[PDB]
Subunit: 62 residues, 10 copies
């Protein structure tokens, strides 16, 4: 398990987390809860872009 | 489920995620990768603060 | 490779899931004694969550 | 899942929680953390006594 | 890492889950002889639970 | 989507894993009294395994 | 921390779950050839279960006592 | 939510894991007769894998194309 | 764990992945997404064939 | 309760773990033919990852905007 492997693991986890945030926002009729989850999902998408950048830098094949 | 239970689940997951980020920062010998994981850990702790706030708002018994 | 803060986070995550279970089981019971047993368990677990959040804040500057 | 089944599940989870609290108390070097976990283990053991009693009453 | 008390707790937790499974299977069974089989197994496992609690209280003052 | 035979097989499989656990925990030792407790649990579980195999045999004509 | 008898018990437990899966898949199929494929697999796994029980009995005298 | 081909793929995947377990147990075993029991089980599970690959190729023309 | 066992693990994972891709193709709304998943399934079937060949040659 | 973008995210996450497995199995192998086999599988999976990230960007404007 090297650095690129840990980056891939973090990216995979972030993608699943976004899925969870979107599903939980959809399940709520509370506007404040939906806003909470939409903000979290946006911050997680930022993290995804950052991880993909690090992966492309560190992985030649990617 | 209901909203409070899903918030509790989100908080539990975020706490495990911080553990992972900090562990990966420790495991790396590349300083850039270490810094990446430390930055991720800091922002996830902010997410934890937000979630605890939501829980306190929505759970009278917790606040 | 875990430190004290990682173990506190794990305990807190487990407690949040435990509260979910207690409140669900309190709801699913129609026996007042059992519903009440589970409600008392959930209140005590919420107390544990507050204590663990305090520990986390006291040992983690990023939090 | 009836009431007695849910109590058995809670009791089993409480027993694993005690094991985890005691292991984490053993593993910590900060004394305050270490006592935090010991306090949690004592409280959970009291929970176990209550659950055993409830199980005896209903079963 | 584990000591005798921790192993006894694990055994007790497992026995409790086992009783739940035996009782659920008795409820779901069609053949009344199979139902009787699962009911008997549940009763014997409950006796084991009593014994495990006794051990745990002999070896743990708290 | 489980029938009676499938539940018997699940119970038998669980009992076999339980015996493994009792034997490993007896080996872990530390206290003779704890070892004897785990050994007694293992012996009674073996009784259950035999009865479950016989059940399976009457109910499963392909197994018998 | 496994000895030979524990590995035998583990194989037997896995085989029993596998038979459950084969019988369930045979029931869930509408193609008769696929149904028959799963039923044949189930019968062969049951033969393996018999062999595993014989091995367990030969290695575990306390278990053999109940047969 | 599963068709027959997906159930065949699941059975094949499980058989492959089962072979791994049997070969590992054969390597770990001390009694030569237990070692041989596990080797016997591994050889017969490999035969099942061959049979299931043939079934999958018969049911999945896209898979058969690559053989 | 030896080379043949790792090949078996890869093959078992690839078979589960094909199941997932076909399910997602059935479930998808957008035609391009359906086609994306079906194309992934086809490529994975090629990977399955390669792994079976390797396994037959080495075992 | 899954939409197309969620299924894309799930496939991408699975491919990333698959690449990890292929690379670790290449490292753990002593037979050069097996090692090259696993490296080849990893390269092809990485191409799959590029395709999926492109699909994700097209389906998720919030992700496209980074
Ligand atoms: Ca995450
Ligand atoms: Ca998270
Ligand atoms: Ca807890
Ligand atoms: Ca607990
Ligand atoms: Ca048990
Ligand atoms: Ca058992
Ligand atoms: Ca099997
Ligand atoms: Ca198998
Ligand atoms: Ca795959
Ligand atoms: Ca994959
Ligand atoms: Fe994150
Ligand atoms: Fe997050
Ligand atoms: Fe950021
Ligand atoms: Fe952030
Ligand atoms: Fe607690
Ligand atoms: Fe509790
Ligand atoms: Fe308490
Ligand atoms: Fe028992
Ligand atoms: Fe039993
Ligand atoms: Fe008994
Ligand atoms: Fe009996
Ligand atoms: Fe056979
Ligand atoms: Fe077999
Ligand atoms: Fe055979
Ligand atoms: Fe088989
Ligand atoms: Fe692949
Ligand atoms: Fe490809
Ligand atoms: Fe793929
Ligand atoms: Fe392509």
């Amino acid at each position: 398990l090297d650095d690129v492997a840990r980056i891939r693991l973090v990216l995979a986890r972030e993608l699943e987390t976004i899925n969870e945030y979107e599903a939980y926002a959809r399940a709520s009729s509370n506007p404040e809860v939906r806003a909470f989850f939409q903000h979290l999902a946006a911050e997680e998408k930022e993290h995804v872009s950052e991880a993909v950048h690090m992966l492309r830098m560190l992985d030649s094949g990617q």
